[model samples]
Target: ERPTLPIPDLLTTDARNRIQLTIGAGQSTFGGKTATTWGYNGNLLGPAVKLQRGKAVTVDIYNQLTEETTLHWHGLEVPGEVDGGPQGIIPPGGKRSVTLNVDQPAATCWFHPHQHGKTGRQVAMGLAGLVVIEDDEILKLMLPKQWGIDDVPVIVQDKKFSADGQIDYQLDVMTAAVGWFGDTLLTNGAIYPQHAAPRGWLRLRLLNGCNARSLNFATSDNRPLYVIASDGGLLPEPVKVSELPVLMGERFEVLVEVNDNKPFDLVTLPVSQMGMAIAPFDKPHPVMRIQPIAISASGALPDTLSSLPALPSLEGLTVRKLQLSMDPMLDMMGMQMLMEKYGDQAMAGFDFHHANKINGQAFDMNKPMFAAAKGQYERWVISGVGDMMLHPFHIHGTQFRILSENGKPPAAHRAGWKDTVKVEGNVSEVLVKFNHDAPKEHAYMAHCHLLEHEDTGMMLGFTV
Candidate 1:
């Protein structure tokens, strides 16, 4: 008999329930040659899980792989045990379950293996999927509903393939120390993928699943795109922008209206304003192709699609300040020596000396930085003063309204709830409220969006 693959079961109950999943290593011929890989279900990524807000969920994870693994609930808020931080690892061939009651606003969440040192290797081999939570209030709105037609999920990733057609991740010391970059772009696991869309408006859920690459996305024709949501959920109002920069693990929900008779393509290019030259192997490339079908009758775009509730007033919130700094005790010369030893395996695109650290400390699986009160609004001020690499900050439990970047309020495109925000070499402030009540045993995680950085100890956790 042939071996069987695991499929995640979707739960639709009004209350919280238990979910079982298995993480194991496998192999696939991504390009042509077989390569060792990992995933939640079959060969690669897992299935889409649809959920409801204000419900409770328990995920029972069985580690069938050779190494330790843990599941990070990416954007969901629950009790500590279910949060899946560094302390929540399941040993090899062992089983562990996390339970939490969903108490936050409705939006799309995701899950992936987040075992401290192996996140990049595991996620690169697959082991990730979408978790959609619905609310009666948001479901009542009028939006596109043609599954695999008007609405689609786009998982954007770059992969490196070996001569035998396998997804390879044998990174050298340089690449591993700095960051890893892929040569081929894949959308929903398809190379140079194409999607057929109706003449009316279509919604695209964009996920930057690349390891270290940041994308400045726009339409090839230079048409304006409507951003309906960012990271967590729907925005107060749509923002018209030509280009948006999305880093790894970040999500952007945009609505594009196709009216012309000709087909249009969605493109992701490097931001010229950054003044950084693209590497030969890591050049900017096309991600997906959108073919618009002809519509006999033209239709007007909706002025308003969804209404977002106003953020709770910040009148009585206590303020907390956090500073992010790089570790000064790293051994750069030793890393270079290791890179020399593994000539072909070294990662060679950026500076490695400045890519480590967060808040002056390395990642410690045992210690969480902060803990807050449930249902209380608070102001968090974070400063990335000396860090050279841009850290895309992410909060696991709740979406925050960005108050300012360097003392100025967020741009028009960022006026909505967000789970991830790019914090450059400046101070950024965000206002967040912990509305969900998770198990006190498990704490929610907040960390840099860079996977490699998170793997090397740039992440921390907290609970309310």
Candidate 2:
């Protein structure tokens, strides 16, 4: 069925440049039944917000849930207090106003709950949204500007449910370590939802909001997915390809043309070389069916999306090796001795929690684990030293460019800037420069984007 909302929720009609949002609990139907869920403003996922360059905006977020909640702007370039990390929290029945002086390139960013340990459960229960930044250059293209019609937001997330169609909490040490995989897939909080597409050129703002699952996005008929942008912003030119990988915590904007009036299916193919020992995902998953009805042509797809400048030189820059490991350091006799200290709690995922390590140590919330100068650029070598599963390493406060993956050039979609890159192989090298207002006390975060691994302490803090 088509969307009941003729106009999808947008926060763009404020004379004072202010937005009012409420994080509340409601009942939403999925898999043919209604269940309690968390959302922003209304039921299900939060609505999309639009902003322009060189303007100032403010958002008032009120938490109506029983526990503490935080709204984080996943990819926007804001300050530390407004970035909505663990430092920014909204207590129960409280509210706060976040102001942002709009600066950054036009891109498709996202927002979600970034609570320390509960981020996994809170996002699994449904609390995420999108932010679309527009500038004069983007408006000159005259692309499909209509929302939910010619241009649409495809927010994909995986969820697990019980037999009664309710949210289920299934977590053991093995499942937690290997990352949680839901048997069901959803788009814009709907199961098996159909979309009516317009003819000619169309754009899809895709967000891979899944917690730990990496998706190989493609079409059923193997049509071209003309990728125009990556996580950080628009690419210099469109990369036409058959398929692309949208790992967890990444976003891509693509364009496709339809001349006939037949239905097209966007599918998720298998990652045969993901290197996960116990990957639960099977092959060739179906996402949504798009039934396009012929209409007037909107416009031609642009060949060049943006003109990006060259990055700074990596000459004479220090190389820091971020070793990712998960060794429990327990021998046969030593394991028994440590098991006696924690008793039965050790078996309940506590042992696995201590096993997940980053830079040879787990996360300590009270201290800054690493330090770097504010205006210095360096080469960061992120390696999976002794890891079994793949990790999508993500850093907050700044974006970087992937220099090489496994000593080779990056993928097609990774030609642009990125804040999150996969570390599935033995090593992935990146060139990064820190220019944000990061203080010594208020540090930024960098860790595996896998929600389970992050909750289990595969993270560290750094000051710039």
Candidate 3:
């Protein structure tokens, strides 16, 4: 028998309108090997925090690590002051509190470290958790409302281990260029975990928490997955599909029919169609094993889930074009030359290297790349510029609707509101509108969800 899935505890707001988190280091023994790890409020990962809609919640974060870090709430429509961008840093033995008004719809979001130049390393060291937004709309629907039972939280991540039973955080040139790919897959902090699901409809909240790899969700027996929601919230109706492509930082809620008492595996298919040319990701990998038990079924899924508004008119809208590119070797040589020539003053005027950049420029702290007026809708066109690899584009603060993908309409699974989309050497147009105000001190971020690319500077900051 395999190990059971480690369902994180649920934490709600207290009387003080705040939830607490202590970021510290711990050790975990998996397969008779102990590995050092860091997490929020736990030894490996944090709890699955539940935030109520229409209520303002504050998060009190305490950093007990040796270095500086920041907790970023992914997929939330909050102000930039609490968005936890790179500028918001929590140093060693420091504490920071962020307040956010839960105004968005119910959706599956997450939280992780977002410190500049250290996001990838800190995340790989084990510091990520899930956030489930709740509202009256989802509760009225006939969906699985149970927590840690039929409605499961599956956070998938791949990690590599060393011979001494410790996690290997080394990054080579190519691996850092493309993204990190691990030899082993971990679901909900367990290695290939097994779940004894009830014999009925099961709602699986799937989150692709990888640093760079994209995955295709599928079952071993080719079962049809009913996609009920996307990144923002519940879709108008469930879309039945054979497989769904989930990029890094993307989330989806699917319903699986479990009728028989047999066993099946929830796995990820090959992502070759996305142009990922790496081991473990180029092939199939099992995420979790499911064994159905003899239990009663739940209510049937409703035909309609939520009533989302239509996209506004596109006439006379401002269009912003952003090009993404990366060249690791050129960046290395350029930085080397600068260091040898100018010694300590090498980076005085140098903006960016070739490792990763947006519009031929790197991320500049405290600088606003662009500004958008609040409540003004604009069209953002993000492209890869002939780059062979795929970049999972993500925007902070607001959830936008996909206007088109490579000049065509998005698939059924991508019809709902989203914050992250895949740009595979083509064009991706989205309708964005910032509902909150952000100052220059703490602004929103737009960048590739690949952790290494983001840390290396394929990112831009925008003020609203």
Candidate 4:
């Protein structure tokens, strides 16, 4: 028999709406072998944190790991001070507190460590968790409301393990150019797990937590999956699709129809990208096994999920062009020059491992690349430069609407609000605005969601 899927504990706020989270090291068994791992108040992945809409909550974060780390609310819209960027650092055995008022609609966000170049290593070491925001609109629906029963949280990731079941964190030059990919697929920190789902319409809150790989989610039998929400919140109506692409750091709320008692698989088909012509990229991997039981549940689908706002005027809107560049030869030349200049001290104090850049420059904590006016809308045209990989562009502090993809209207599934959009060779333009004031001291970031690329220099900062 397969192991049951691990449904992380749901952590709610206290009477005063405060939650305490401790990050520490522990061990988990994979493939019958134990490996050292880290988590928030646990041994593996962190718990699913619940937040109520219109209510303010404070999180007291404690870091017990040997190295320093920061707990960044990936999709939360908060002030710069509490947004948990590189500036919000917590040393070993230290603690800090941050607060945010949940003002948006119900959405599936997440939290993870964001320590400059160490983000990739820490996240791969199991330092990420889901943040579910609830409101009156979502609670009033006749959907799968029971946690870990009808409604399941699926965190999909792939990992490469060593002989002793330890993670392979070694980064080669080619791996840096492309992103890290694993041969083994895991869901919610469990390897090839099975879920005993109710025999009805099941709600799956799907999160693609992969560092570099973009997932192509599809059922084994090719049944249509209804998409109800994106990264920002619920859509106006559900979009029916046989398959959907969930990129890195992006979230999707999908409904899987389980009308019969037969068991099936939800898996990711092989994705064809420019730089990803390798082994694991040539095969399909299972995300989870859905085992239907005799429990009764809702089978009716709602005509409308949520009421979205009207789009702002496009007349005279400001447009900004951003380039995601990847030049391996130029980067090699730059590294050689640096090595010749400083000799032994050239590699000291240098943070970025690769030279991939955003708009011709690397990420600078003290230097802000641009500024945005608060409450003003602008159109961002995100494109690729010389040679670029498939980049998942993510903007902090606000959610945006996709205006066009390669001068065409966005797909039906992507019409909803999004904070992270996929940017391949084709161009993607979005309408964005920041409501919070992000000062230069702790500015907001707009970067590639590929963790390795981000750990390199494919990131930038902007102050609002």
Segments of candidate 2 deviating more than 4 angstroms = 1-8, 273-281, 328-350
Report the Cα lDDT for candidate 4: 0.83
**What's the residue-level lDDT of 261 in candidate 3?**
81
Better of 2 and 3 by TM-score: 3
Encode model 4's per-residue lDDT on 1-464: one tens digit a residue: 18899998899999888999999999988888888998998988798999998999989999999999988888888887888889889999999988888888899999999998878889888889989999999887787877898889999987778998898874545445567767778899997789998887889999999888788899888888999999998999999998988889999999988889899888887776533324544656678899999987774568899888877898988888888887666446544653453354433213336577888887777898888878889999888645536788999998899887645788888888899877877788989988888898889989999887888878888899
Which residue pairs of candidate 2 clash?
Answer: none
Instruction: In candidate 4, list every pair of residues with a backbone clash.
Output: none
- Sort the candidates on TM-score, descending order: 4, 3, 2, 1
Which of 1 and 4 is the better model by TM-score? 4
Going through the candidates in order, what is the number of backbone clashes in each?
15, 0, 0, 0
Q: For residues 1-464, write the lDDT of model 1, one tens digit per residue.
A: 01111223443433347666778777755444577777775567766666677666667778888888888878776656666766687999999876656666556677887776777877888778877677775666556645466767777777777776766774434344445557676677666667777787887777888777677778878887888777777776688889877767877778888876576667776643111223432344666777777643233345664666676677878887666655443335434654565443343333433436566666665666767777777888777776555667887778788888655787776767787776767888888877665443566777777676676666766767
TM-score of candidate 4 versus the correct structure, residues matched by position: 0.93
lDDT of 3 by residue, 264-295 (tens): 98989877522243445555678999988876
Candidate 2, residues 247-313: lDDT per residue as tens digits?
8889998887766787878777766422121223456776777778766657558877888767668
The lDDT leader among the candidates is 3
The weakest ten consecutive residues by lDDT in model 1 span: 1-10
What is the full ranking by lDDT, best candidate first?
3, 4, 2, 1
Task: Name the candidate, 2 or 4, with the larger TM-score value.
Answer: 4
